[PDB]
Amino acid sequence: SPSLWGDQFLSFSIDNQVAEKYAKEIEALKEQTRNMLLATGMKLADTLNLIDTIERLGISYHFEKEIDDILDQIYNQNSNCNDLCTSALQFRLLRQHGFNISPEIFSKFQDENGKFKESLASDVLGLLNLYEASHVRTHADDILEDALAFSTIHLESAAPHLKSPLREQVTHALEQCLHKGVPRVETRFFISSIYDKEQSKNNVLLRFAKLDFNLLQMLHKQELAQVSRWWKDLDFVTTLPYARDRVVECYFSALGVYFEPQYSQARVMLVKTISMISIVDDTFDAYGTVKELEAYTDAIQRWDINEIDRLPDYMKISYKAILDLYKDYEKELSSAGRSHIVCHAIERMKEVVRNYNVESTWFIEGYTPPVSEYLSNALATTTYYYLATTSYLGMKSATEQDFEWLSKNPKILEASVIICRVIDDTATYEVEKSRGQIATGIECCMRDYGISTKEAMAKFQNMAETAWKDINEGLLRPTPVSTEFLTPILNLARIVEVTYIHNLDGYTHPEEVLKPHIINLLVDSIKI
Numbered sequence: 171s172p173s174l175w176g177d178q179f180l181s182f183s184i185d186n187q188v189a190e191k192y193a194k195e196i197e198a199l200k201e202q203t204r205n206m207l208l209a210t211g212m213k214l215a216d217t218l219n220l221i222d223t224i225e226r227l228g229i230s231y232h233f234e235k236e237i238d239d240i241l242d243q244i245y246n247q248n249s250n251c252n253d254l255c256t257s258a259l260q261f262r263l264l265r266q267h268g269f270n271i272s273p274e275i276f277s278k279f280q281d282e283n284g285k286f287k288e289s290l291a292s293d294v295l296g297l298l299n300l301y302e303a304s305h306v307r308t309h310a311d312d313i314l315e316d317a318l319a320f321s322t323i324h325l326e327s328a329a330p331h332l333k334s335p336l337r338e339q340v341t342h343a344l345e346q347c348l349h350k351g352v353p354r355v356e357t358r359f360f361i362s363s364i365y366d367k368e369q370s371k372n373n374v375l376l377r378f379a380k381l382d383f384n385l386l387q388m389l390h391k392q393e394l395a396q397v398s399r400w401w402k403d404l405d406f407v408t409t410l411p412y413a414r415d416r417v418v419e420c421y422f423s424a425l426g427v428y429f430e431p432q433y434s435q436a437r438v439m440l441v442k443t444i445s446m447i448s449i450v451d452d453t454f455d456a457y458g459t460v461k462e463l464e465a466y467t468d469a470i471q472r473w474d475i476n477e478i479d480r481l482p483d484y485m486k487i488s489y490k491a492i493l494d495l496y497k498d499y500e501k502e503l504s505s506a507g508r509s510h511i512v513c514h515a516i517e518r519m520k521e522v523v524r525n526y527n528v529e530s531t532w533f534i535e536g537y538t539p540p541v542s543e544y545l546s547n548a549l550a551t552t553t554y555y556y557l558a559t560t561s562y563l564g565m566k567s568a569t570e571q572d573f574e575w576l577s578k579n580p581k582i583l584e585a586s587v588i589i590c591r592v593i594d595d596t597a598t599y600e601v602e603k604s605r606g607q608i609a610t611g612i613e614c615c616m617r618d619y620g621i622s623t624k625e626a627m628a629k630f631q632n633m634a635e636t637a638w639k640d641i642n643e644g645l646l647r648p649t650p651v652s653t654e655f656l657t658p659i660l661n662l663a664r665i666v667e668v669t670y671i672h673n674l675d676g677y678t679h680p681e682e683v684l685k686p687h688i689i690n691l692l693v694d695s696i697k698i
């Protein structure tokens with residue numbers, strides 16, 4: 171299907187006048203908020219709720235240091251706001267920030283048999299925070315083994331009779347927990363559906379959240395326009411008609427990896443790569459021959475525009491565009507002398523191409539590999555090792571030692587890649603199966619373990635579960651690299667959860683899952 175967006179994003183003229191107005195009041199609101207954080211004499215519950223609100227409002231990136239200092243202090247003090255609500259929240263915020271706070275803070279809320287006291291089933295605010303906390307657990311938090319099921323059943327039971335906006339918050343949470351959602355998406359929901367309708371809302375924070383969100387949206391729109399023109403000038407739409415035209419959906423991903431203004435250059439580099447690798451994918455799937463695909467793979471490994479001759483005219487178009495793109499990246503980074511890092515992204519791309527070729531070889535032979543062998547090849551084809559690597563290109567702070575750590579396939583990255591693989595395999599099984607693609611994950615799983623499609627899917631779900639625990643562990647201090655370089659990997663996993671929510675295929679169908687988000691993040695501004 172052709173792009174549903176049209177030339178809608180092609181042109182965007184920022185009203186510098188309005189943007190300057192927003193920038194100026196935001197700066198003042200920023201300081202008022204800073205002083206709220208630095209206020210002495212606040213109770214623990216009030217301090218935690220303040221930080222939690224600023225994060226959900228999507229403005230916490232302005233106070234990364236003040237929030238860190240406060241959570242550090244709270245971490246170094248340990249306490250018993252003897253209630254579930256404050257305890258679960260404290261646990262969650264500390265864990266999401268890398269502080270390894272003990273899970274035993276939940277002991278006082280469980281019986282002698284390890285299970286949560288059923289007598290808490292009437293504390294909705296406690297159940298909600300426990301619910302959100304249950305999603306940041308690691309392999310060492312067996313104490314929280316039943317937290318999810320427990321809080322879920324009682325939240326479902328209470329939801330219908332709660333007041334608004336709390337009811338909407340509970341219902342949304344049951345459908346999408348905070349820890350695993352895309353930040354801009356959760357922030358947009360919280361601001362206009364929840365906080366804006368909160369009777370006890372803090373008008374200063376709300377004003378701040380709306381203006382900042384809309385101000386950034388202007389930046390996002392500018393970037394997307396810039397990328398749309400770039401995409402239009404390549405004109406693969408008329409040249410390579412077999413390919414998908416989803417530059418908008420590709421941008422959403424880049425936006426999900428990082429939304430901060432300081433990452434503008436990174437987002438633009440990232441979208442172009444996602445967009446570009448998407449064409450290579452379509453070329454291997456619906457268009458090329460074993461001979462064509464073979465020469466394509468080889469040309470890519472050699473990586474020299476002298477190879478453009480050994481390729482069919484249509485593949486010459488893809489190939490040249492790819493080398494030019496990396497040449498542009500090299501050019502873009504000259505200024506800072508960070509052009510030497512481009513090679514890391516290139517090596518990852520070559521890897522994706524190789525496995526794509528193996529993937530098609532498996533399809534042609536009708537091979538159904540054991541899960542073990544399937545993953546050895548299918549993990550890279552998610553393109554995730556490649557996107558994570560690509561996401562660092564525009565991060566002015568990323569060093570050679572940072573890429574070096576990533577090149578070794580750290581557990582956190584591996585976890586994120588596995589999540590994308592198993593979830594995608596579960597959501598796209600039946601469709602790929604109807605295409606004769608018998609080397610699909612669920613199939614390999616079924617044959618390998620000699621189980622049903624249901625049992626296989628359930629197995630992949632456990633792999634995803636295990637993978638999230640690994641990610642949560644990977645965020646704990648001391649981290650192998652700055653948190654700044656872990657967040658992009660976490661966000662990639664989040665994008666997976668959001669794109670295939672309820673096992674709906676949002677990869678093969680944009681209008682089914684992403685359309686709403688794209689409208690709320692890139693079309694409609696939050697009305698003040």
Ligand SMILES: CC(C)=CCC/C(C)=C/CC/C(C)=C/[C@@H](O)P(=O)(O)O
Nearest residue numbers: 419420422423551552594665666669
């Ligand atoms: C806005 C965006 C980016 C939405 C979708 C993001 C998402 C998680 C893409 C999954 C990529 C997979 C794994 C494709 C193949 O490996 P295949 O076609 O073989 O399943």
Ligand SMILES: [Mg+2]
Nearest residue numbers: 451454455526
């Ligand atoms: Mg493919």
Ligand SMILES: [Mg+2]
Nearest residue numbers: 594595598602
């Ligand atoms: Mg698939």
Ligand SMILES: [Mg+2]
Nearest residue numbers: 455598602607
């Ligand atoms: Mg496929």
